[PDB]
């Protein structure tokens, strides 16, 4: 395995877990070496959208240890897409577990310290069994692999052009908070748009009004403004990133910075020297000029990244590699 | 038993089974096994890419079977596909492979006389492994069917149903493509109506919640004391086949006009009745709608009205062949 050379793309790893709910309860899980899912032709899961899914990442810290990432964090918003979807919700302690089970058993494809790669675990939760008609599914299953990933761009930080959409990931009242599968299908088409007219993604406005900025691809926005606060949207259709939770945390409570979470109007771009998009799979991505209107506004540089966001990436890959000590209950070591 | 027939899925012979690789759908095939075997990093199980139809095939009087407008069904799919960007079934592909479920199961079709269908699930699923948000590579396109009651909500008899404040679909989202999100938002809306003791949810304009766009997952109509046949039209309503039918025979066979516009909900007093239509039930008759905690009740809590049982009347039978179809709308299997 080439570590340098990953980067986020499905791998076939030894072992994930697999759990089956029937009869109200969760069975005990098991390990398997299957990747294929066997699934009713019926599945609410393939009909209805019942689906969610969640995403963290392990590294190997210096010393030889291995940090999860916040799974706790995982484990709550998964118990809220799972209610928002009348789907079984798997209890904090047993999800935890699970996560760590899997990176026990996949421990040969976790990068080496220094590579900037990680182990990506992906958790889901999918309505299963013979059904017909939209209703909750009568099984479920909650399953995880993992994949070995690398940089999400190549080459390091670097900014990135994005385009304002037309279209709307989620309803005002819908279930944008929620990470579930209908919110990504309906980002299929903008997305495209977006890259067949050459930028990194699609930003969505508030679905309402299409006045302020909601999120940008499947990532989070950040503005830094003159006078140094990170603002982020906050709205009912927001999907509330655990990346964008932890930003906010090591700003107010390490970096000394200010944190507003409110409006983001699109007509008022001008008031961030610099902006970023945040998630897990990318950690932070730049933004380097959003088009809206067919005009590039630039908020910093289209060839440098801003120092605040250096700084926030400095801090944040810090904690998650174990090279700057982790805020409190953060770290699970596997 | 023809008798206790509703909406539930039991296992029929065959389901026809299509992939999609490189760039072309194979040929087809019909196969015993109703068990998926698809990647864990399947789109449709990760990214919501997937979408599905609906159609009956009837056993008529003279021992033929009709399948019920299967081209338009044909159609909405190629779009459904299209907004999800999902290879499209081209339309004699598709109705090809729906008759042949149907031949292969005709067995489980009821007996005419019984209101009784065979009702085929054709549906278009991302697959293969794959991570982060994108259009699969591979693809499954299949149908099962199952044999289906149509007085399974009921018939004719009125139901109570309840505005949401929440929406099933966004104003510029997969609203008017039939992709399991929007079923998927609607699971809990549903669900509160129903704990409410409301038969079902009804969902409007998630811009501004004025207009009547969804009732459950049937649409909308109403008819005006001045005798208009009205149903919601916007970019987020799902374009219903049975909404078309009625539409097309309202206005050639019951000489109605019909206005495809805005339905207000502080208007419902402009109409004297209001149903919702769909595949599996044909019409269920609309007794009252709840808004503000008040009941609007628009014909009887008991009784369905006059221009819905023409209306029913008149769709049914064009189905069943007990009366002359408009051209083009059945297909002979
Ligand atoms: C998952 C996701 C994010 C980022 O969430 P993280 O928990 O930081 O990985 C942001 N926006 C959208 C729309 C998402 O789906
Ligand atoms: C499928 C559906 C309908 C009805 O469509 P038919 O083609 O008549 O079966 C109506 N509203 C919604 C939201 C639907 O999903």
């Known amino acids: 395995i080439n570590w340098d050379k990953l980067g986020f793309d499905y791998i076939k790893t ?25 699934i009713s032709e019926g599945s609410t899961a393939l009909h209805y959208g019942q689906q ?7 590294y ?52 080496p310290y220094g590579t900037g790669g990680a182990l990506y675990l992906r958790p889901f939760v999918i309505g299963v069994g013979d059904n017909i008609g939209v209703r909750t599914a009568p099984e479920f299953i909650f399953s995880i692999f993992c994949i070995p990933v690398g ?20 309803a005002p009242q819908g279930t944008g908070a929620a990470k579930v599968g209908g919110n990504y299908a309906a980002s299929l088409m903008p997305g495209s748009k977006a ?47 655990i990346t964008r939770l932890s930003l906010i945390e090591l700003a107010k ?5 200010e944190v507003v979470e409110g409006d983001v109007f699109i007509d008022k771009l001008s008031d961030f020297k610099e902006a970023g998009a945040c998630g897990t799979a990318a950690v932070i991505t730049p933004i380097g000029g959003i088009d809206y209107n067919d005009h590039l506004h630039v908020f910093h540089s289209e ?18 590699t174990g090279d700057i000590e982790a805020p409190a209950g953060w770290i699970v070591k596997v």
């Not at 409570?253 to 910075?257: A, F, I, K, S, V």
């Open 151 to 170: 940089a999400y761009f190549k080459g390091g930080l670097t900014p990135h052009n994005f385009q304002i959409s037309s279209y709307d990931r989620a």
């Open 253 to 257: 409570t390490r970096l000394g910075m």
């Open 14 to 38: 030894d072992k994930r877990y697999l759990s089956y709910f029937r009869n109200g309860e969760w069975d005990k899980g098991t390990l398997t070496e299957d990747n294929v899912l066997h």
């Open 52 to 58: 969610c899914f969640e995403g963290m990442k392990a």
């Open 60 to 111: 190997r810290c210096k010393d030889g240890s291995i940090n999860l990432f916040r799974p706790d964090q995982n484990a709550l918003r998964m118990q809220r897409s799972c209610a928002r979807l009348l789907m079984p919700q798997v209890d904090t302690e047993q999800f935890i577990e699970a996560c760590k089970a899997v990176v026990r058993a996949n421990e040969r494809f976790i990068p």
């Open 303 to 320: 060839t440098e990244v801003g120092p605040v966001t250096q700084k926030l990436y400095k801090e944040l890959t810090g904690v998650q």
């Open 195 to 241: 890259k067949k007219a050459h930028f990194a993604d699609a930003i969505y406005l508030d679905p309402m009004t299409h006045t302020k900025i909601e999120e940008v691809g499947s990532a989070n926005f950040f503005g830094i403004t003159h006078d140094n606060k990170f603002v982020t949207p906050n709205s009912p259709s927001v999907l509330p990133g």
